[PDB]
Every structure is written in C-alpha cells, then in structure tokens.
C-alpha cells in the first residue's frame, strides 16, 4: 500500500541552541514494519556545532516502529497525509529542548521538516562542552489523550567522563486525519551514532524501535 516494506526519507532541520543557529540536511532508509532505519546527516550551516550532537539525534522518525498486529499503528495509518509532533525535553541541569516537526509522504519517500530550539544549557555543562557519549536505551510510554497519541520517557545520556545526564521528555504526535488511536503501550528504542568525522559535521545513525 502506501507504506512499503522499505522506505527512504529526507530530513531538513533548522534551529538554535543557546543562541547558536544551524541547519542540518539528511537522508535515510529503513524497514518500517521491522522498526529499523539508518541515516546520513550533514551540518549545512553553522558547523561545526558548538554543542553535543547527541541532543539532535533524537529529533531526526516514528513511521519506523515495529508494532504487534493487535496494536493499531496510528502513525503509519496517518499516511499519505502524515502527522505532526511537538516535543519538550527537560534536562536535569535546566537545559530545555523544544521541537516541532512535520512528517509527510511525497512521491514514495518520507519528508521530515524539523525545528529545534535549545536554551538554558549551562556553558560549562556536558552539552555545551560536548562531553556526551550517546543515549542509553529508552522506553517511551505511549497513551492516547485529547485526540492525540502522547509519549513520555526519561532518557539518559552517557557522559564521556563517567556518569549519566538525564532528561524528562514529553511528546504529542498528531495524525493529519483521525485514524485509529491505540490503547496504552510502550515503545523501546536503541539509537546509536555509527560514524562521525572529527568535528561531527558528518554523522550517521541507526535506530531500532519496537512497540510492546
């Protein structure tokens, strides 16, 4: 049908973190029913970034989440029109990241438009000093509320110096048509940076996500 067993995507991201503006463009591919995907991203403006790429990686794809048959796959069902999402991440040291995203399907490939704002990150923190080392696996609590599918999760970022750096995350995912919302369930994620040049202006990532 509209969602094939293999799908490519194009992504464009604009934003600002602690006042630093940037643009990122990327292309990816994956297997939406198996919950797996990879992408190649390039910082096209504002590179090299003065902050950890790790805060941007989750803002680059929910059409690729493996679901059981008895769970309506609301975000897949939303296509060809698609869906929008709005996210707020509250980090333990007061940093905040907010995101608004549009997902659409244009002639057989997914199109992602992302806007990112980060603010209040301590200048001496792991984000502005780039001391981060990738996200631990996460479980997102999914639940229907107010005509939308909501997600909530605590995410933990590994630090290069030893510890962990935590965020509280809340996201609203909204189909462009009112397709069948699921009941409550959990989506488990693993997101890895698989390749990156010295300054991270070219980065590759891989993610597996499965609803339980």
Residue numbers in the entry: 6 to 65, 69 to 220
Give the original sentences from the paper that presented this experimental model.
The two mutants that displayed the highest red fluorescence intensity, mPlumAYC-E16A and mPlumAYC-E16P, were further characterized. Their absorption spectra displayed three peaks centered at ∼390 nm (neutral green chromophore), ∼510 nm (anionic green chromophore), and ∼590 nm (red chromophore), similar to what is observed for mPlum. However, unlike mPlum, the highest intensity peaks for both of these mutants in the pH 7.0–9.5 range are the ∼390 nm and ∼510 nm peaks, suggesting that the majority of RFP molecules contain a green chromophore instead of a red chromophore. mPlumAYC-E16A and mPlumAYC-E16P also mature to molecules containing red chromophores that emit at 639 nm and 637 nm, respectively. Interestingly, these mutants emit at wavelengths 10–12 nm shorter than mPlum (λem = 649 nm). This is presumably because they have lost the dynamic Stokes shift resulting from the H-bonding interaction between the chromophore acylimine and Glu16.
To create a further red-shifted monomeric RFP, we investigated whether the AYC motif could red shift the emission wavelength of the far-red emitting RFP mPlum. mPlum is a member of the mFruit family of monomeric RFPs derived from DsRed and differs from mCherry by 13 mutations (excluding N- and C-terminal tags). Its fluorescence emission wavelength (λem) of 649 nm is the longest of the mFruits and is red-shifted 38 nm compared to that of mCherry (λem = 611 nm). Ile65 and Glu16 appear to be major contributors to mPlum’s long emission wavelength as replacement of either residue results in an up to 40 nm hypsochromic shift. These residues interact through an H-bond between the side chain of Glu16 and the acylimine carbonyl oxygen atom of Ile65, and this interaction gives rise to a dynamic Stokes shift that is responsible for the far-red emission wavelength of 649 nm. Chromophore maturation in mPlum results in a mixture of protein molecules containing either the red chromophore (λ = 588 nm) or the green chromophore (peaks at 391 nm and 506 nm).
